[PDB]
Structures are given as structure tokens and as C-alpha cells.
Design an enzyme around this catalytic site. Sequence first.
Site, short mmCIF file in Angstrom:
data_model
loop_
_atom_site.label_atom_id
_atom_site.label_comp_id
_atom_site.label_asym_id
_atom_site.label_seq_id
_atom_site.Cartn_x
_atom_site.Cartn_y
_atom_site.Cartn_z
N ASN C 80 57.14 -78.72 28.17
CA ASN C 80 56.67 -79.87 27.40
C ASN C 80 56.97 -79.81 25.90
OD1 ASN C 80 55.58 -80.86 29.84
ND2 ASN C 80 53.64 -79.78 29.49
N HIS C 81 57.29 -80.97 25.33
CA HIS C 81 57.60 -81.08 23.90
C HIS C 81 56.41 -81.67 23.16
CE1 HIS C 81 62.09 -81.78 25.21
NE2 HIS C 81 61.54 -80.72 25.78
N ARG C 82 56.52 -81.75 21.84
CA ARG C 82 55.50 -82.42 21.03
C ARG C 82 55.56 -83.93 21.30
NH1 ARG C 82 52.43 -83.06 15.60
NH2 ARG C 82 53.77 -81.71 14.31
N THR C 87 59.85 -86.64 20.48
CA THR C 87 59.79 -85.55 21.44
C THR C 87 61.04 -84.67 21.34
OG1 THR C 87 60.83 -86.76 23.27
CG2 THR C 87 58.44 -87.00 22.99
#
EC number: 2.3.1.-
Lengths: 211, 212, 211
Positions: C80-82, C87
Site C-alpha cells: 500500500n501507498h500513501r 499515491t
Amino acid sequence: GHGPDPENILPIKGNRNLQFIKPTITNENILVGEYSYYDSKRGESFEDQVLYHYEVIGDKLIIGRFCSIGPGTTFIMNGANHRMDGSTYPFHLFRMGWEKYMPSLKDLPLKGDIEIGNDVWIGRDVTIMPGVKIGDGAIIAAEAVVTKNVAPYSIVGGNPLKFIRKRFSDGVIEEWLALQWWNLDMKIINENLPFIINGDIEMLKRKRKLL
Amino acid sequence: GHGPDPENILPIKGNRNLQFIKPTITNENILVGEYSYYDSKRGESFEDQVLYHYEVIGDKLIIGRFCSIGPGTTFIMNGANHRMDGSTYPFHLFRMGWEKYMPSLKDLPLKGDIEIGNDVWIGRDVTIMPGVKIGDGAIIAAEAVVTKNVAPYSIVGGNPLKFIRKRFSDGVIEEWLALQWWNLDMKIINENLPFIINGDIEMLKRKRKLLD
Amino acid sequence: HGPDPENILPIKGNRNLQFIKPTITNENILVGEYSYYDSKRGESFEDQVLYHYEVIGDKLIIGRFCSIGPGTTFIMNGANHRMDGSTYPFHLFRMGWEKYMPSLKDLPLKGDIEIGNDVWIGRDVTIMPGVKIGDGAIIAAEAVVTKNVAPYSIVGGNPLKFIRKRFSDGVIEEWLALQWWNLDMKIINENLPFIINGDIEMLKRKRKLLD
Ligand SMILES: [Cl-]
Ligand SMILES: [Cl-]
Ligand SMILES: [Cl-]
Ligand SMILES: [Cl-]
Ligand SMILES: [Cl-]
Ligand SMILES: [Cl-]
Ligand SMILES: [Cl-]
Ligand SMILES: [Cl-]
Ligand SMILES: [Cl-]
Ligand SMILES: [Cl-]
Ligand SMILES: [Cl-]
Ligand SMILES: [Mg+2]
């Protein structure tokens, strides 16, 4: 000049699977914006993930900038489409007297081009159907089969595709779509990276003195 | 008689992936009709896509004629279905005393044969579960998991499988099913081919009315 | 009596079916005895654990006597990314972007993947981050586990759907109170005909004379 070279295929010198897609492109009818990367599994090229893409059909694959494309992500083009008027059997492929039944491009269910926006995060092992449009800032869950269009800044996933939720309020999305930070110069982007990353959209507007 | 040789394993020039299935069948209980093809990925054999298929079980995989079977399509037969009365752990496999715990096939939840009809288009990377019947002329969407029976001339897809829509009207479907062009001679199949392809069912119906 | 849980290849001739526990070399992977991985071509279970990074410290925990089908994948939190704005993982490419690395608070971390005992996981299943799977649960093939799985329930599909409970509520409670996987191997080998045929009423009699 903060940031990597968008024309450098392997930006991360320790990594050999993560590739900037654009400078690896060889075929036509494939347009991929700068900084969009493909995190491969065993080092395979992005184009290998593009299937059923025949020049004769003329369909195109467009991907915006700053896109994250997960490993195993597959793009199915219109070549996969069988004729559905009578039999779905492609007799013409085998010839030996059946080549006379070669279909016209208008006999085939052409769904159109695949269009992927900017700042798009595409999960691992996602499959994308022909004619699918994907909006900017969209998030696609892993293992998803994208059977329809995806709205900008929306989270989706599943087989068939299901709408999970919208990332921000309708008003905020408008502001991101009106800004288009991905189309600004790298000088501007670098000076705006903090607010882009923490999503402070009301600071970006102050940063860009508009009329 | 115009057309390719159904006995020819690789009927397309410059193609090493698309194969005619029937002449590749080495294993038993895999009954595949003529002209049904499997378009492989890395040129893999069709039988390798058939999993958990043990001969003594008499578990059969039946596929009609003129089927389009996409790459990565796998067929799950009964075979390695663990017991579901208590622990699903297959102790007997490891033996060394546990071999006496081999499940009786009366205690096994056998689903039956996988039966696929004629003129069926199965998309890329489809998984087909045990005991599933698939009717003539149906279309299985890519990446789909066939967990239930598929009606003739219907479009399905998803995980689990969902009914998308019927290909034609009920009346038109009846006409195709009354026709059974796949069961006709290759001579008259060629004679009807331009209509079988463009879907001139009215003409096809007229041709068959004439053939009485 | 029975196989040796420290034996990587418990079956003669089988080079694909492995006991998971004696194969573990990496950290934050905890697998119980007799739990096996029936690999496609002999690949190690650890290779099926993806996006597992030390800097996050998330763990993969699996009980005893679990059946894990080929191609099963475990997705950890490193994927998962920010999601507050862009993203796009700028920090990865460095050259001035390394400063933009997200903190743990910035990431939507979902926690550990916990799987109970006697769990049947079908072929080509994908396990999402933070997923808890109860004991005796059955995971259908090709399923994408996007949520918690109740003990002794059958689930499948993408996204995950609840098919049915294996037994009644009362019987489930009795299995959960029994925990044959925690009994000594001497006791298990005396109760195997009951563990397999599901006759738990006879086990309650046997556990009573044991307790
Ligand atoms: Cl081409
Ligand atoms: Cl279009
Ligand atoms: Cl929806
Ligand atoms: Cl911040
Ligand atoms: Cl069942
Ligand atoms: Cl349905
Ligand atoms: Cl004939
Ligand atoms: Cl690491
Ligand atoms: Cl640093
Ligand atoms: Cl012990
Ligand atoms: Cl029994
Ligand atoms: Mg689904």
C-alpha cells in the site's frame, strides 16, 4: 534537477524489475506518459503485458503520467474479441478455404481504446478489459478485473469490478482535476511535492496564483 | 472438403500456441470434440490444464466441437477434494501409519463430470469447477470462475460466476438448439458456413427445413 | 507415529509438497507444525509472501495442520501507498525525493495476517493484509480474501463472499473447545479416526477422561 530521469528505464539502480514504462515502448498505438512505472515480476517488459493488440484493429492504449502499475497487470485489447452474430468460432484463422470468411473490423465487437488517466495506482495482477476508461487519481485493488469505466479518484476492485468508495468529496476531486499537477513543469511539481503528497489541495491553489 | 485437418495439432502457419485439442489427448476420460481448440500461453499442453484428474475415479471431462478455449484456462476435477466431515487435513498422504486413514470414495463429496457443449467460447484464464455443465453456444468471460452450470447461449463471468445476459432472444436460441450445426456433416457445414458466421438464423432455419 | 514435522519433503517422490515450518528462513513468518504448502513447481512458501518488509514489522502467523494449495499468495502491508494525495511513491526514485518517504502514521497499515489451525486454503488464493482466518475455515480456490474469515466457515470469490458455515453453532463451539491441534501427538494418533470422521461427541467423551 530533483527527481530521476523519466527516460531512464531502470531508475532505481538496485532494482531491476521496476521500469519507467515510456522509454521501453517499441510498438505503436501505445502512449504512456512520463514517470509511469511498471513493477515487473521477473523483469518482463510492459509491452509483454499488453495482449491482443493488433495494428490492423487500430485500437490504442493510453496511460497518463505518474501511474503505478502493479506486477502481472494485464491489458486485454480488442484482438480477444470474437464475432457474436452467429458462431463465436474464428473459422478464418485456420484458412484452408475458410479465409473467405475473414471478418471485417465492423463485424467485430470493437470496444474502443483503453484510456488510463494520470496519478493512477493499479494493483497487482489486475486485468483490464477492452474499451475501459480510468480516471485520474483512481485506485484499483489487486486481483481486480476491470470490466467497466472507473471514475476519477475512486477506489474499485473485484471480479467483476465493484465500486468501493470515492477517495475525496466531489468538490475536492473537481479541484484536483482542475489543477492537473501532472501536466506542470518539473520545476513547479518539485516546489509543490509536499502538498501533492499530503493532499493539501487548498495550499496548491495558493501556490498557483490564478486569475 | 475445405477446412483444416482436425487431426492436425498446430493448424495455423507460424503459430505454436493455438492447438487442436483432440489429437493431443494422451490421458483417459478426456473426451474432446473435433475442431475444439486451446490457445496456449507458452505452448503448454491442454492436458496440463486438467488438474486432479485420476483415472480410477472414472472422472470425465467432456468438451464438444468447435469450442474456443482461452489460454490459462484450467479444469479442476474432483480428485484432491479433502473430506469435510471433520478435519480437512489429508493425513493419509503422509503415510507412515496414517495411510490407513485413506478416505473411502463414498465419504468423498464427488460432484461428477465437467460437461462442456459445442461452439463454446471460454475466455483467457478461466477456472472451471467439478461437476459443471456448460451449454452449447455459451460465452465464458475472461478470468471467470465457473462455480455453477451455464445455460446454453448465455454470457457469464466473475468470481463467483454471475449471469450477465442472454446472447439472443429465447425464440432465436431455440432455433440454434434445434439446428445443431456442429452435428451436421462437414459438407453441409461448409454449405451453411457463411450463415453460421453472420448469424443468419432465419436462413439456417430455412436450409434445414429444406433438408427434410 | 506419523510423518516428521521437521521434514521439508514429507512424501517420497513428491518434490512439491513441503512442510512450511522447517523451510522458514525469514523473520516475522510464524508457521505451525504439519502445515504444508503444495507448490506448483517446488517453490518455497516464503516466495509466496509478498510485500513483506522489515521496516514495517508486520507478521504472518499460521497455525498447525493447514492445507495450502499451489499459487497461494500472501500480500503484506509493504504494498500500500500513501493515500492522502498522490499515491505515487516519489521516495523510491530518490535523487532529491528520498525526503518524501512516508511515515508509518501516513500509511494505511492493516496489521498482521493471522490464520488459525486446520485451515484449508484452496489453489491460487490471495490473502490481503490484516486478514484474520478462523480455525477449520475453508477457503475456496481462486478466492481473494479481503476480510476476516470466521472459524469453520466456507468462503470464496473476489471480493470475498460468505458461502456457508460447515457445522451448527453448537458443534463449532465444541471444536473450538477441543483444539485437537494442541493435543499431544500421542493423543491425536489415538483420536484420528474421530478427527477425520467428524464424530466429536466421542471426542468430548475422550477429552473428559483426558481432563
Ligand atoms: Cl501487429
Ligand atoms: Cl474509444
Ligand atoms: Cl458497482
Ligand atoms: Cl504531512
Ligand atoms: Cl461443498
Ligand atoms: Cl446470478
Ligand atoms: Cl463428416
Ligand atoms: Cl526487507
Ligand atoms: Cl535517506
Ligand atoms: Cl508432542
Ligand atoms: Cl468413518
Ligand atoms: Mg466477484
